[PDB]
Ligand SMILES: Nc1nc2[nH]cnc2c(=O)[nH]1
């Protein structure tokens with residue numbers, strides 16, 4: 001580690017306009033636990049391949065090549081100054097698959113996904129450039145923010161249903177148990193057991209699911225191949241807008257309602273991510289973590305535009321991988337003896353994820369169980385969003401509102417979500433603004449609270 | 451008119467009848483005009499089971515209509531037998547039961563299946579109720595699990611709106627949830643002439659506006675209004691009962707077990723929600739002493755289910771409460787003696803009026819083309835209240851972290867999975883949690899998900 005950090009100061013970097021550039025070994029140290037974690041947990045990156053095969057009609061190797069593009073994409077946040085361990089807009093997957101499902105899987109569905117993803121890029125770019133992203137984090141009421149987070153969490157679960165199982169159950173419970181039990185103060189100091197688990201993070205739950213999954217017979221054994229992965233970019237190019245067309249203007253319209261809801265859901269992920277960062281920022285007094293919402297929009301905008309052209313992504317580019325981000329945050333809060341900086345954990349993780357792509361025996365090992373990894377990220381997201389959304393509710397008038405908001409955001413048709421927000425406005429103006437149904441004071445609530 | 455009136459601070463007049471306390475309308479409690487008007491309209495949710503009967507059980511409309519008369523009599527048993535919980539279906543368990551039924555040929559085969567399932571749920575309610583073990587579970591079961599069940603059940607309910615089969619429903623849902631929310635506050639009716647007039651209609655405004663929008667937009671065909679008195683074709687209905695068709699082999703009862711159990715776990719949540727709301731308004735209303743007998747609720751519910759099994763097998767099953775109706779009565783009840791005399795005068799009047807309403811053929815035929823709005827609405831609204839109450843009932847962050855895991859597994863539609871979770875949860879609990887490996891969990895230690 002060339003440049004070290006002064007206590008209470010910000011992590012070393014090179015100023016780069018709206019971005020703060022950090023490289024591994026130069027600006028932050030290389031974390032062995034996040035290395036091992038990314039060497040194994042990149043399977044979730046590979047877990048998109050089945051969706052690519054179904055909805056985009058792509059052969060396995062073309063799908064495998066796409067994940068190299070996304071792997072590069074996952075390192076941009078810690079590269080450009082974002083403490084949010086990136087991923088997909090995972091609670092938007094069901095909505096996005098719903099959209100794609102109305103196109104023939106193949107070139108037609110690829111043009112469709114291009115139109116959806118470039119818009120999502122544009123929405124992120126404008127809200128980030130005009131700094132209108134930061135405003136919304138401040139302006140939007142807490143009830144709505146919590147309604148969105150919870151709704152987004154419940155969407156993640158109508159999804160586990162729609163994408164397509166003892167594997168997933170043991171996977172979910174062990175994963176969620178570790179996640180939960182390692183969010184407490186001084187856990188590692190209490191037992192030798194929790195000390196050793198904390199260095200593996202999500203690995204135990206994932207690997208144990210696979211194991212149960214193999215022996216039980218839910219998924220076939222792998223056919224391990226030795227050597228270095230050889231991404232077929234010639235093939236991949238056939239499934240890019242460079243080869244297939246670009247969509248007619250009419251397609252962009254069909255995208256709009258899905259584009260928007262996919263953003264609203266991502267906005268949730270930003271709230272969840274910085275909720276966790278803000279917390280561990282206060283625990284760790286030795287680092288000054290910058291929380292720039294506009295930069296998260298910018299990086300994410302870049303990641304999507306990049307994807308749109310080079311690897312159209314059914315899960316889209318999202319601000320965080322909720323469980324990976326929570327897992328790193330937990331290890332970060334454990335102290336400098338454990339993790340030097342939030343970027344040393346965030347950065348190393350996906351860096352190792354990128355290299356891991358080239359470990360052909362791992363790629364080939366994970367190949368028959370990719371479905372376990374896909375449904376698991378969905379389940380784990382749903383868990384953390386529900387948990388965080390709930391806790392962020394302050395009184396009972398917020399909860400009364402968040403309930404209405406969550407329920408509408410978990411009905412999968414996005415035109416319908418907009419029809420709700422629309423009708424919600426009309427009802428608000430004619431009834432609520434005049435306070436015809438009264439003011440709502442949490443201390444007055446006698447039926448649902450107290 | 452009301453023969454026996456209640457002394458202030460006492461329990462509502464009744465006739466002792468063993469485990470039950472018998473109350474008739476006009477004799478033990480007054481006849482509430484608002485709940486009369488409400489049940490004259492809101493009995494549509496009772497008729498909204500009809501499509502499920504047609505679809506999953508393969509029966510013609512009229513056989514299904516007659517079934518709703520059997521259910522209608524069933525809905526009056528709680529207030530008749532001393533249960534302050536406005537009754538209904540096990541609504542978050544509908545997807546699960548449909549999933550179960552979905553593996554049988556719609557028709558006699560599926561009716562035999564639904565019998566075995568409903569007799570089982572009945573037996574479970576009977577045994578837990580006779581052995582007073584229903585009361586035990588409500589006390590002993592940790593709060594985290596109780597809330598996990600409630601939140602779980604709430605989310606399962608929306609996987610149901612997706613699975614059962616729409617601007618109508620959005621308007622219906624938002625207005626209905628809006629009213630319910632805003633009429634849960636103290637002195638609301640004293641605030642505005644608007645809320646004063648709204649409170650006397652309860653769920654009706656949301657329902658009727660959903661129906662209307664539903665007609666005018668074209669999502670549902672116009673009704674074919676027929677004048678006169680409903681004439682339930684019980685001759686026809688008999689053909690689709692286990693009396694006419696067979697009774698299922700032992701093998702089927704075994705397939706039913708895992709679904710039966712989960713339908714109970716979900717009903718248990720509905721019991722918690724109902725008595726959460728009752729206990730609150732019981733303290734608001736100091737002039738009435740409301741007895742909260744959990745075991746009596748199991749008995750009446752057990753009776754209702756066994757009743758159904760033979761006379762009208764019910765895809766939604768017989769459940770401890772209709773969540774929005776119970777929330778609605780409780781709200782109007784909390785407004786004071788000027789509005790509602792007793793929790794039984796409103797709850798009792800409501801379904802009494804629903805039963806009479808079945809015989810109003812102009813309303814049946816009016817509601818017929820638009821039943822789908824009604825069925826989806828109760829699903830959405832149950833999800834809404836369960837989520838709201840489950841969340842609020844959580845006290846710390848360790849309870850919440852546990853409730854999260856539980857909610858997520860109980861909202862996966864396969865019921866065998868929910869048990870594999872409880873199983874794997876036990877195995878995991880015994881080997882890791884009890885030896886206290888992975889540390890203690892105290893909410894003030896929580897720095898990631900709390901503080
Ligand atoms: N938002 C989000 N994106 C992901 N990409 C992979 N996993 C996840 C997740 O849990 N959440």
Ligand SMILES: Nc1nc2[nH]cnc2c(=O)[nH]1
Nearest residue numbers: 538539541772773828832
């Ligand atoms: N549990 C339950 N059962 C019902 N039956 C009709 N409506 C409902 C409801 O909201 N909840």
